[PDB]
Amino acid sequence: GSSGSSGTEEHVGSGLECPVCKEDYALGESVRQLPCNHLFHDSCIVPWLEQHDSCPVCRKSLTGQNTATNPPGLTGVG
Whole-angstrom Cα distance, residue 43 to residue 30?
8
Selected from 16, 44, 46, 49, the binder of Zn ion by CB under 5 A is 44
CB of 77 to Zn ion, least distance (A): 20
Kindly report the number of other CB atoms within 10 A of residue 13's CB atom. 13
Q: Between residues 27 and 75, which has the closer beta carbon with respect to Zn ion?
A: 27
Binding status of residue 32 toward Zn ion by CB under 5 A: no
Selected from 13, 14, 30, 60, the binder of Zn ion by CB under 5 A is 60
Binding status of residue 58 toward Zn ion by CB under 5 A: yes
Whole-angstrom Cα distance, residue 28 to residue 46?
17
User: Which residues form the interface with Zn ion (CB under 5 A)?
Assistant: 18, 20-21, 36, 38, 41, 44, 55, 57-58, 60
